[PDB]
Amino acid sequence: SFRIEYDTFGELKVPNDKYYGAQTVRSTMNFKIGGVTERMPTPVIKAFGILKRAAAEVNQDYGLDPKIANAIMKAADEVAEGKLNDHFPLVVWQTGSGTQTNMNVNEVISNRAIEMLGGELGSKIPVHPNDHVNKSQSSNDTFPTAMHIAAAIEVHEVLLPGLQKLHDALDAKSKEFAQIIKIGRTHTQDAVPLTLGQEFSGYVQQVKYAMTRIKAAMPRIYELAAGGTAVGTGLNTRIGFAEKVAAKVAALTGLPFVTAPNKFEALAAHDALVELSGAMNTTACSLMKIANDIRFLGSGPRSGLGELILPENEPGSSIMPGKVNPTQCEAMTMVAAQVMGNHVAVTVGGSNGHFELNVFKPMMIKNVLHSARLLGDASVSFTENCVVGIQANTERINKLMNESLMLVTALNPHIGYDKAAKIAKTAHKNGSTLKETAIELGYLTAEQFDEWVKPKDMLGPK
């Protein structure tokens, strides 16, 4: 149930049902770090299929046999569509250039193309992993290209649409809560009123600005290293390959990829990934604040803040009515913490390039893709399983507005500062309301209190 292949170090058993070859088996033997959960992220694998599909078509310009190119293109399409994920067993913790994964991409695409052509698996005929599938490319400029394709597609498909959905649901709730006045909190102390809508509109703005920040990190991610070859000069590739492969990847993906203007900058560093991680890191801070607020605003039922009633998506206890754990807030704030740690990992790698090549590439793109997927998915989950079903506990909020000591300043132009203060002090001492106290002190009538103390008039400048 295995075939025998060879590398210059010896013979290796390759399972008959696997499209990878000797280079990949050897790689598995030498990089056993962390297990299966540490396998190279699927979006990197798919991005490699896109790049190899692109290169094969372009290389027809540079002597690649059209019949061989087309089988390569078809096989690379299968990789890009996620039909061959089981033929990539290598972990992130390999070489820092991601060379093993490039070799394994080349082998899988070679062997599947060979199969399509009716050839023998493991024979390198008629499709050679290096000479055909890796034609005009280098170990050093392929993985970086795969990283950026992967990141851009993830931001485009997962991260940004997730945040947009969250934005829209937060905005919708903002409008729904536009007339519900509650007591502000500063330093967590009671403070002057604001609407739930105003408070939520802050969250909306943060998510809005988060999307702008992420978008602003994308132009440098669209720059591709393909064509720099070994050290940046483009030695051993062809004139035109850099520009054509970028345009081809752009046509296949519909994203505006271009070749990096400076290939030395593109190979020796991944500052673009650091900046993209940076924008996600800010996004995590916004989302930590939005989810934690909502967590606390939904606390109760009676020893908390109790402003919000959160959807209950999973069974509680009938003898515990009103008690609902803010589960999605917890998922979201945990993601937020992860992103911040991922950002430090990304940063340490990005800072440690040496001369012509940064060799921390797999760990950098892992952490960027991890953060982008978590943020996107959590946004969608948080939206659908919490935000959209949020209701205001208007009964409890109205009660707490009436029990507040904050509104007492509304009395000042009518009874003066000292009578207003004495009302607040006495209410504070007796555990009664401003109105009850103000009446008992004979300072005003109930009818006067209602006319003079209007929360709706305490929501803006004059």
Curated annotation (Swiss-Prot):
GO terms for cellular component: chromosome; cytoplasm; cytosol; extracellular exosome; mitochondrial matrix; mitochondrion; nucleus; site of double-strand break
Residues of the site described as Important for catalytic activity: E330
Known outcome of mutating R185H: In HLRCC; catalytically inactive mutant; abolished ability to promote DNA repair
Tissue expr: Expressed in red blood cells; underexpressed in red blood cells (cytoplasm) of patients with hereditary non-spherocytic hemolytic anemia of unknown etiology.
Catalytic reaction annotation: (S)-malate = fumarate + H2O
Disease: Fumarase deficiency: A severe autosomal recessive metabolic disorder characterized by early-onset hypotonia, profound psychomotor retardation, and brain abnormalities, such as agenesis of the corpus callosum, gyral defects, and ventriculomegaly. Many patients show neonatal distress, metabolic acidosis, and/or encephalopathy.
Any one GO MF annotation of this record: histone binding
Nucleus is among the record's keywords: yes
Pathway(s) annotated for this protein in UniProt: Carbohydrate metabolism; tricarboxylic acid cycle; (S)-malate from fumarate: step 1/1
Protein name, entry field: Fumarate hydratase, mitochondrial
N6-succinyllysine modified-residue sites: K13, K18, K32, K67, K74, K175, K244, K419, K425
Keyword vocabulary terms for this entry: Acetylation, Chromosome, Cytoplasm, Disease variant, DNA damage, DNA repair, Lyase, Mitochondrion, Nucleus, Phosphoprotein, Transit peptide, Tricarboxylic acid cycle, Tumor suppressor
Matching SUPFAM superfamilies: L-aspartase-like
Residue positions binding substrate: 97-99, 128-131, 138-140, 186, 318, 323-325
InterPro entries associated with the record: Fum_hydII, Fumarase/histidase_N, Fumarase_C_C, Fumarate_lyase_CS, Fumarate_lyase_fam, Fumarate_lyase_N, L-Aspartase-like
Homology family: Belongs to the class-II fumarase/aspartase family. Fumarase subfamily.
Modified residues (Phosphoserine): S318
Phosphothreonine modified-residue sites: T37, T42, T188
Residues forming the catalytic site: H187, S317
Highest taxon above the source species: Eukaryota
Functional note: Catalyzes the reversible stereospecific interconversion of fumarate to L-malate. Experiments in other species have demonstrated that specific isoforms of this protein act in defined pathways and favor one direction over the other.
